[PDB]
Amino acid sequence: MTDRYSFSLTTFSPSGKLGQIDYALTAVKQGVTSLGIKATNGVVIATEKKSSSPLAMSETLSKVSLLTPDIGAVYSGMGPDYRVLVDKSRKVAHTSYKRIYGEYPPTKLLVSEVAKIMQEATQSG
Amino acid sequence: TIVGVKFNNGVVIAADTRSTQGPIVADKNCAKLHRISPKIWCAGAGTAADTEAVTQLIGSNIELHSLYTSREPRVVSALQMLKQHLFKYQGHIGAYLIVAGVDPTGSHLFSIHAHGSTDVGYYLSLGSGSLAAMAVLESHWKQDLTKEEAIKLASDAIQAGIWNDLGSGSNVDVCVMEIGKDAEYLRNYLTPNVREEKQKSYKFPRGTTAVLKESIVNICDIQEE
Amino acid sequence: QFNPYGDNGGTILGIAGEDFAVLAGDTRNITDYSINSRYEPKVFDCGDNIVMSANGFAADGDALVKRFKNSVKWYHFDHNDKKLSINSAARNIQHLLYGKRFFPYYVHTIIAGLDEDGKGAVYSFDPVGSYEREQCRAGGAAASLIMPFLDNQVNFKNQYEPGTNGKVKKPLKYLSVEEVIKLVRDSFTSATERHIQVGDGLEILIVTKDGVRKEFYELKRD
Amino acid sequence: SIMAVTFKDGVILGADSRTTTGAYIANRVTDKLTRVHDKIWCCRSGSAADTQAIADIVQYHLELYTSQYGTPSTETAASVFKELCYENKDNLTAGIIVAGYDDKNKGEVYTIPLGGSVHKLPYAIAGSGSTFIYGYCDKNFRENMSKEETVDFIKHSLSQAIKWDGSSGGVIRMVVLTAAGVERLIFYPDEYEQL
Amino acid sequence: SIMAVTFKDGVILGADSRTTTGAYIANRVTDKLTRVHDKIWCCRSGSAADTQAIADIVQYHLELYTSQYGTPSTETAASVFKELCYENKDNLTAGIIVAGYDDKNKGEVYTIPLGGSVHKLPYAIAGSGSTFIYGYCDKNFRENMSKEETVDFIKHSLSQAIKWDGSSGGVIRMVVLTAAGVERLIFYPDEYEQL
Amino acid sequence: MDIILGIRVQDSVILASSKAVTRGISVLKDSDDKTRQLSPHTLMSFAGEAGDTVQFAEYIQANIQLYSIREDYELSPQAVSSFVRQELAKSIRSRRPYQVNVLIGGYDKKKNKPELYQIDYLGTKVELPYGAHGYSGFYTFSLLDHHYRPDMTTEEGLDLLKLCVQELEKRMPMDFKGVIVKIVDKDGIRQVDDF
Amino acid sequence: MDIILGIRVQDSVILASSKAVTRGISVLKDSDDKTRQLSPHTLMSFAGEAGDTVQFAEYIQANIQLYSIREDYELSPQAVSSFVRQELAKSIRSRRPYQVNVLIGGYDKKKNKPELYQIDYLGTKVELPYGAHGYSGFYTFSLLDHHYRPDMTTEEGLDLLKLCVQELEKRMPMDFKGVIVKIVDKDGIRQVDDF
Amino acid sequence: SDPSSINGGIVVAMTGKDCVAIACDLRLGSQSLGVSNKFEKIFHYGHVFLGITGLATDVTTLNEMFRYKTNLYKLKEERAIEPETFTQLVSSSLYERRFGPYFVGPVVAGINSKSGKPFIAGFDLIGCIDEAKDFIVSGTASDQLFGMCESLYEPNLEPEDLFETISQALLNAADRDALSGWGAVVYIIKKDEVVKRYLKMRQD
Amino acid sequence: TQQPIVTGTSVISMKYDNGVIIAADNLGSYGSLLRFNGVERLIPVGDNTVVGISGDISDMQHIERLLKDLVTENAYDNPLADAEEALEPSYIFEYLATVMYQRRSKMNPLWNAIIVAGVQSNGDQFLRYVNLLGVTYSSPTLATGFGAHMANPLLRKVVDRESDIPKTTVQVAEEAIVNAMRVLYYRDARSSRNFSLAIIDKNTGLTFKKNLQVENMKWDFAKDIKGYGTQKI
Amino acid sequence: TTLAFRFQGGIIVAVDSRATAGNWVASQTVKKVIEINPFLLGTMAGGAADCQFWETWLGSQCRLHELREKERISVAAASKILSNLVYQYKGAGLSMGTMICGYTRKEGPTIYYVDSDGTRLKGDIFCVVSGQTFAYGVLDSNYKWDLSVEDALYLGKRSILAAAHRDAYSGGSVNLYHVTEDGWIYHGNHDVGELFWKVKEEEGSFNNVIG
Ligand SMILES: [Cl-]
Ligand SMILES: [Cl-]
Numbered sequence A: 001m002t003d004r005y006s007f008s009l010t011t012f013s014p015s016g017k018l019g020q021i022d023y024a025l026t027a028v029k030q031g032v033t034s035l036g037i038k039a040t041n042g043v044v045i046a047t048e049k050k051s052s053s054p055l056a057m058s059e060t061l062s063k064v065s066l067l068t069p070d071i072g073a074v075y076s077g078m079g080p081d082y083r084v085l086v087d088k089s090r091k092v093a094h095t096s097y098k099r100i101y102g103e104y105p106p107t108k109l110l111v112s113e114v115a116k117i118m119q120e121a122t123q124s125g
Numbered sequence B: 001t002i003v004g005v006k007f008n009n010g011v012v013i014a015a016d017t018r019s020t021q022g023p024i025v026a027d028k029n030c031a032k033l034h035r036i037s038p039k040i041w042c043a044g045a046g047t048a049a050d051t052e053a054v055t056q057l058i059g060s061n062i063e064l065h066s067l068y069t070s071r072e073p074r075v076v077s078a079l080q081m082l083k084q085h086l087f088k089y090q091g092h093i094g095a096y097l098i099v100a101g102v103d104p105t106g107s108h109l110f111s112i113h114a115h116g117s118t119d120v121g122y123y124l125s126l127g128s129g130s131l132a133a134m135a136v137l138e139s140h141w142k143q144d145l146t147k148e149e150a151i152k153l154a155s156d157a158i159q160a161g162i163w164n165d166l167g168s169g170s171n172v173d174v175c176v177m178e179i180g181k182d183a184e185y186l187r188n189y190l191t192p193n194v195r196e197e198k199q200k201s202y203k204f205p206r207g208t209t210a211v212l213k214e215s216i217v218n219i220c221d222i223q224e225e
Numbered sequence C: 001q002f003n004p005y006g007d008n009g010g011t012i013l014g015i016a017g018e019d020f021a022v023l024a025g026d027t028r029n030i031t032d033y034s035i036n037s038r039y040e041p042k043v044f045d046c047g048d049n050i051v052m053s054a055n056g057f058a059a060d061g062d063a064l065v066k067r068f069k070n071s072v073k074w075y076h077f078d079h080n081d082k083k084l085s086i087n088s089a090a091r092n093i094q095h096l097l098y099g100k101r102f103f104p105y106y107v108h109t110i111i112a113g114l115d116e117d118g119k120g121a122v123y124s125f126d127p128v129g130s131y132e133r134e135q136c137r138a139g140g141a142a143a144s145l146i147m148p149f150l151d152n153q154v155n156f157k158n159q160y161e162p163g164t165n166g167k168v169k170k171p172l173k174y175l176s177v178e179e180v181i182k183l184v185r186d187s188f189t190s191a192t193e194r195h196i197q198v199g200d201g202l203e204i205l206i207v208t209k210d211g212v213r214k215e216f217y218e219l220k221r222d
Numbered sequence D, E: 001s002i003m004a005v006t007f008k009d010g011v012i013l014g015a016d017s018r019t020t021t022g023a024y025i026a027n028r029v030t031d032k033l034t035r036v037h038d039k040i041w042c043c044r045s046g047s048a049a050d051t052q053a054i055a056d057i058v059q060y061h062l063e064l065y066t067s068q069y070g071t072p073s074t075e076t077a078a079s080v081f082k083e084l085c086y087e088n089k090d091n092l093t094a095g096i097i098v099a100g101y102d103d104k105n106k107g108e109v110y111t112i113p114l115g116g117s118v119h120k121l122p123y124a125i126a127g128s129g130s131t132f133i134y135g136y137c138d139k140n141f142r143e144n145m146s147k148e149e150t151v152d153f154i155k156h157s158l159s160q161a162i163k164w165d166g167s168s169g170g171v172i173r174m175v176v177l178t179a180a181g182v183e184r185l186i187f188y189p190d191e192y193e194q195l
Numbered sequence F, G: 001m002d003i004i005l006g007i008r009v010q011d012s013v014i015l016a017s018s019k020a021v022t023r024g025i026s027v028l029k030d031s032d033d034k035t036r037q038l039s040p041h042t043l044m045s046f047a048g049e050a051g052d053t054v055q056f057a058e059y060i061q062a063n064i065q066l067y068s069i070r071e072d073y074e075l076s077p078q079a080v081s082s083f084v085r086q087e088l089a090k091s092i093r094s095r096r097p098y099q100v101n102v103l104i105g106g107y108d109k110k111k112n113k114p115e116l117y118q119i120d121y122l123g124t125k126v127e128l129p130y131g132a133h134g135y136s137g138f139y140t141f142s143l144l145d146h147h148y149r150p151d152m153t154t155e156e157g158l159d160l161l162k163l164c165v166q167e168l169e170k171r172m173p174m175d176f177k178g179v180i181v182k183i184v185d186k187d188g189i190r191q192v193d194d195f
Numbered sequence H: 001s002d003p004s005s006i007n008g009g010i011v012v013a014m015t016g017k018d019c020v021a022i023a024c025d026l027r028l029g030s031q032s033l034g035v036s037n038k039f040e041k042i043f044h045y046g047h048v049f050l051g052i053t054g055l056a057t058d059v060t061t062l063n064e065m066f067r068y069k070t071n072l073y074k075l076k077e078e079r080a081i082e083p084e085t086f087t088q089l090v091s092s093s094l095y096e097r098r099f100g101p102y103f104v105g106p107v108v109a110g111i112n113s114k115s116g117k118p119f120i121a122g123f124d125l126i127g128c129i130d131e132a133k134d135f136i137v138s139g140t141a142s143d144q145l146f147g148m149c150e151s152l153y154e155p156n157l158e159p160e161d162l163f164e165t166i167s168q169a170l171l172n173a174a175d176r177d178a179l180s181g182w183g184a185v186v187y188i189i190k191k192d193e194v195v196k197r198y199l200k201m202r203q204d
Numbered sequence I: 001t002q003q004p005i006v007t008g009t010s011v012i013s014m015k016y017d018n019g020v021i022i023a024a025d026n027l028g029s030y031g032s033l034l035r036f037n038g039v040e041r042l043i044p045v046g047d048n049t050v051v052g053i054s055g056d057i058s059d060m061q062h063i064e065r066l067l068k069d070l071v072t073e074n075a076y077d078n079p080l081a082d083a084e085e086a087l088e089p090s091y092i093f094e095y096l097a098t099v100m101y102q103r104r105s106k107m108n109p110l111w112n113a114i115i116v117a118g119v120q121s122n123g124d125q126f127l128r129y130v131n132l133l134g135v136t137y138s139s140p141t142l143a144t145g146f147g148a149h150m151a152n153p154l155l156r157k158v159v160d161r162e163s164d165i166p167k168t169t170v171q172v173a174e175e176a177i178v179n180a181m182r183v184l185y186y187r188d189a190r191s192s193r194n195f196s197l198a199i200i201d202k203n204t205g206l207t208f209k210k211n212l213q214v215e216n217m218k219w220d221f222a223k224d225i226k227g228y229g230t231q232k233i
Numbered sequence J: 001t002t003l004a005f006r007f008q009g010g011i012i013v014a015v016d017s018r019a020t021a022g023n024w025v026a027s028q029t030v031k032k033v034i035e036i037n038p039f040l041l042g043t044m045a046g047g048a049a050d051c052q053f054w055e056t057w058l059g060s061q062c063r064l065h066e067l068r069e070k071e072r073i074s075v076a077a078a079s080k081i082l083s084n085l086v087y088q089y090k091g092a093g094l095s096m097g098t099m100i101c102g103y104t105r106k107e108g109p110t111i112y113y114v115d116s117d118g119t120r121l122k123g124d125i126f127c128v129v130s131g132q133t134f135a136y137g138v139l140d141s142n143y144k145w146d147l148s149v150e151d152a153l154y155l156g157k158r159s160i161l162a163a164a165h166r167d168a169y170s171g172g173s174v175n176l177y178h179v180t181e182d183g184w185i186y187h188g189n190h191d192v193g194e195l196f197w198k199v200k201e202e203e204g205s206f207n208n209v210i211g
């Protein structure tokens, strides 16, 4: 056994494109619409609960997720990939910030951490 | 001195507000009541750094667990996670905790010793003042206590510690956790030890102290132009 | 093994005025983290206008005070009822302490009274009998909290005349009995806050030409 | 003071309710009888923390066993206790009695001293208070006793253990393990002291 | 394992016959029942040397007492044992049971632990093996038993003490003290092991 | 014990170090140089446990020489001292700490100022006009406190150092077999033969 | 540590003793005379524990002086050495033994022969051509085992002693601050100023 | 032998009306021997002041460590760290060496730049937090400082008054400790000015 | 210097308006073994004093004999032995205190903690403590061993200061003592259910109660406690 | 810190006044010079009680000598009384470092160092710097035999100041005594706090300080 895939699966093409990132952005394009609007005294994020079956209880599937008491997240694209990112995002808010400074991270720095996890899935073996 | 008292529709925990280094009182108004989760609080005795660190770590992991499961956290979870951590470190993490809370299962009161042992009770006490506190609890506790009665019993048990224990003192902090209600944290519920006015003002005339040198300290960043 | 020593805590303070002296102590007796008594006197009238306190191990302090009280009785018997002067009492107590040099009295001894010129006097001893005459002395558990305050507020240490910028020291002055009592009360109030072994009550013995009088003030019981 | 006695209809587990630090009773209503499976229980003596940690791991191991292979034997439960106790002998202070009811094997008792050795016995006693009732239990134990007889034997036995041992005390807790199911019994001081 | 039991007609002293250095049995036919007066006997436990030295001094003290004041009381014999044990507590390892028959006081038992304290009791047990029969003896002792009943009670008691204690063993020696006089009984392993 | 002194004058830093190497009651050498040239304008003197002293100094020398080749620049004494302190501060919580005490004398070409640094085996660092390690420090400090002036010349500094060594020889109980003196100025590092 | 050497030449005995008194890392004196005149033709040099050395020497001096007054005779060195050894031999099994090592140099007027005796704090005595106490023993001995000649003169003896001190200064790690030299011959005891 | 009293030294912090004060002695020693009288124990990262007593190698190491951590904080957060937040960072950093701790007694002082609220805190060597309203003490003369502060201190002192109180608290406490003194520094801290004064004191 | 072998646990006491109460359990423990039951540890001296003793029982029996010998000796050539020259509580205490401090100072102590309860000639309540170190102190409430930790807090809620003593009746005082003995039985692993209680009143004299039992105990709540946290059965 | 040195003008004795219990400064006004008799001085180092008690006792034994022999006791004799007494208690834990200084017609100016170990030494200069006894001064450079009395007083005062500054367990004030023919003279107590600043300003020394 052992993970013998120690090499990058995302490489530059002669045209200077990173294929797997472009194809990922194509998957996002197929995804259901989500939006965000910033007001003077708040921010709103919204999306459609595209129910796979009417027998399915769509309340049990959460597309809009609390990351910290003052930070929310919504997505477009592959749902499973979002669910594991929300789990990693919630955890990194604690391990890399709250367990050090004793307060929740500001929006821009939690974003920076989520951004880092996604960059690594773009270069790592 | 930390106590927990179960009542009809909830659980109450109380603690004194003194921390001591040897025979010296380090803090006259310490906070020994810790929020593990919104409706799960615990009181700590032993090494002050150990009880704070262990409640913050488990409180963090409990919050991540709550978000993962989409369920309000359970006391048995915080209890299980605390005891497995303390047991790992074979008592070298000197955290002695009384863990109380209300959850969907009901009201719970536990105590956790630094070697990783736990116990269940309707009334518990821990720390240097536990024997003073347990003496009051064993005298006045009954089955089917009201909320008002349980607060009275809990604060009285802490007073016993404050008065009769040298390691305990100052004020009484209480936290009431009633089923189907918000936990109310009563910081300085009693103030039995308020210092009296001094005989003299020790405010000095200005210029009393001999100064070798004076200088402005630059706290601002490197300026423009 | 068997340990012959113990610690009963408490703190004693002796201040000497121009024509008076005070010896004060808390009335709290402790062992480990338990309170033994909230009122157990530690400052005694020994006769001939002498007040004595031995603070530390309570057993050794009680024994020493007894031996000195006995010592005063035999001074009168053997010397035609001569009044024992504070300097003579001090020297006698040194010999009492040094007698147990190789099994010491685990106590801090302060005695207060008037000297032969009628001026206030305080004498301080170590456990093995080393003694010295002083204006100010604090003994016991909270000695480290109180002595710096007394250095600052009784001897005006590290205080200079405003506008000299440390060129001229604050003038030393004799304090009144009323001012001295305030400092004693403030010192004990402060020591009670930050020392677990100090509290419950404060008993002050004031020594004048007229005799020995006693004042008591309540302290925090936590 | 803890004991497990095998009778006609199954096995009974008895224990006192006292936990101590030096001479101070930390808990006077301690439950030293703990469930590792529906009809496999253990009696805990020694370190409160060590026995709780071991009992928690065994309950986990038997829950996972049950998921895969169905209801484990009392022998299997004893083996898991032994494995934890033997391999970690240097760092553990735990004396455990394992008692269980099968329908094939009926009542069985296994005792695990400090070493981590295993001994299958018709009945077993353990704890500091056990030393005072060795003489009594050996003279009074019969095989294939009734339920009522076996409850009496344990009540009388632990009654004596509590009387002579400072470390034993409080209430006598018992757990009956038969085909019929699981019964909890409690006996208060006013009852067992006058025996 | 040593015990003294007061019954209707007087007192009986029982003891095992084993003396040990570590795990080696130095003597397997030891007589731990020793005469300090015609109807005052003691049971010796602890150091063989210390108990023999103390017993020898007491016999001397009571022989001199008898010369001057006549037959001493059991209380008097107990007091002399206590005096030697208390005043030399730092240098002695001796646990002694004093048993005697008067005609006025009838049967009396006094026990002297290590401290050198004295306790008058209806019966007493001592030695390493005594710990295992505390439960048994407390449940089975009645006041004003017959001679036959009291012999049975001691035989059964020491039988258990010998069974569980490595330090106890050999034969069960007994000494009966009544108005009738002084009777020595011996019970061999083949007899008391099958009880 | 080993003498290492440092004095910082107006325009230079002088280091005096004992030439004797002794382990117990044996004199291993009388011409030992307890100094390493870290850089052209930086000198380090060391005293401490046998082996550790030279090993640490040579290790530091190699690292500073590596930096000089790589950047074609000389690290400032402040920078070299900080690097040395941090290596010692790592070692105290290591499996086997380096038991070495060092003096760092350097001339900073950027500031045109001499600098003296005292660092102990724990990684305690201070900048001083004069410094010393061991028993010798107690004496020499008091003498230097009286005589030292900050605008002293190199010649004046040598005379004061000469006085310190003479007084140390009389007052010290061990024979340190004289000192080696090295001057650090703008022109570099030189050894004063006459002393 | 303290140097005391003795060499016995053809017609005299020369004693060299270190002039330094040190307790720990402090030098108390640099002119100490570690010698007492026992009699006009007998000299004793001593090294050891502080206080004991002088107290022992002065005690021996007083006893020998008492004998001289009482008998109007001088005890022979052999007799004086035997008295000193016996006092030390008593002290080893005493509550607090004297920790003193002595060299006794004397001229016997009856035999017209110089004698040197080495005695340690245990009361070990030998007569030797040359002797020493402490660390300086191993060196000097081997050196003297090569140069000493039985028919050497006093001047030759001083040169050899001069060589021993010079070699000791280089080889010894502690500073003994020079030696005091005293000659014992028929004419009496004199101190050699030039050394 | 005891690491927390080899080098010696003290720190004290106090709150006043719209101000805080922090002060320290200047001594560094090898037990009885005094080595340096220029060893300042108060450092500042922006407008947050940190005093550290105890083993001097750890005082220097923790200063270098907190400079490192507050520099990275400021680059990422794009603002200076506040007293309340820095307090949590000190605690976190000490407790991660639980079973191999730095032998130090840290003290935090500063004014919250937004709320304007004066803030002081103290810590034990493993990072327990003491958040007192009145005053914090640390070092070999902590007993002496507790005594001085408990009697001299009154709430809501003006900056120039608070200076006299904290100065007299330090000076008189240091003079009753063998391992403290050799000079002293006092920082008076207002919302947007900080004055630093060196005190004349006995050099024995 | 020795070690205690057979030991007695807490002695507890307090003052009330007209006298003093003292109590102690009837157990002599041999370590963890509860070996001797029926050991009396309250020893009356005349009709105005009770001496409660904890610690080594062999040393207690020695002190018992010293007190028995003190009564005999006081009667010698004393026509007022049963009147004006009877032994006072204060006399009996100072003697024991003298012995205790002398024995500690020869490094061979009597391994005990002692409370002397009684009423003086003028009707004044006497209550003072001494132990193996010769340390002495007085308080409206006194207790030894575990009593100091658990009994004092409860008794100090009835009499907190000197001014509370006149306001405290014998019924209230006895109630407080009996409750404290029940708490000590719950929580001391070296206590017994069986105890002795002694009242010394300035009007009604010395009342000595033997074979008292801890009653009105709360255990019923135990049945509802299962496992150490997660167990439901 | 106790200092006693010999010069043409007699004996200079300088001591500090600090007493410590561990790191705690118990006193800054302790008298470390005992005036045995008009011509005899004793310095105190080590245990405060041991030195005070036995040097006070020595004064009694010296007084008895005067009565019995109608003559001043010699410094040699007085020193040996104390040295012979402590030797009896040797190993019992007495801690004493002391210098007996006096002038007599028979011996002239004499200093004897007497130890709790039983060591008794005669020398021209003795210094006790916490825990350490030396045959040399803290400075020793300025020391020449022919010195002005008022010049010699300053050296002794300056020498105590040097030790007081560097040594944590030395400090408080400097007590000065001058011993001559026809008795000793007290040269006052100088607070080190005030002294340090003055000396610094006038001498231009302690430059490493700053003030
Ligand atoms: Cl448990
Ligand atoms: Cl035998």
Ligand SMILES: [Mg+2]
Residues within 6 Å of the ligand: D162, D163, D164, D165, D166, D167, D168, D169, I034
């Ligand atoms: Mg029990």
